Design a binder for these strands. Structure first.
Length: 44
DNA sequence: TCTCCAGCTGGGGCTATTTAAACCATGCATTTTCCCAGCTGTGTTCAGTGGCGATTGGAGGGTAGACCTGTGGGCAC
């Protein structure tokens, strides 16, 4: 959960693009919602 | 004869050379200093997260109530 802060929104956006997350979530670009979604996707 | 004048007849001041001394003017060139700009470092603030605490929800256990079955007693043939 920690290194997900160092993701520093922009690289987390690129990671969500890499996993295949739909563009709406990426579009929101939440600093907290984005990291929760990428933690969920890395759990999936 | 004496005075004046007027030309002219032989006489003095330019030029050329070397040298040192101390001096000057007129933009020029160089060196120094001051100022401004940029880059780096440190400090502060903000916000993420960690972490912990509290509240809510779910599950399990216990107690209470109700229903069903069994036994006993009373009554009737």
């Amino acid at each position: 959960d920690a290194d997900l802060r160092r993701l520093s929104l922009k690289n987390a956006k690129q990671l969500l693009r890499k996993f295949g997350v739909p563009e709406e979530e990426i579009k929101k670009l939440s600093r907290w919602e984005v990291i929760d979604v990428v933690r969920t996707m890395s759990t999936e």
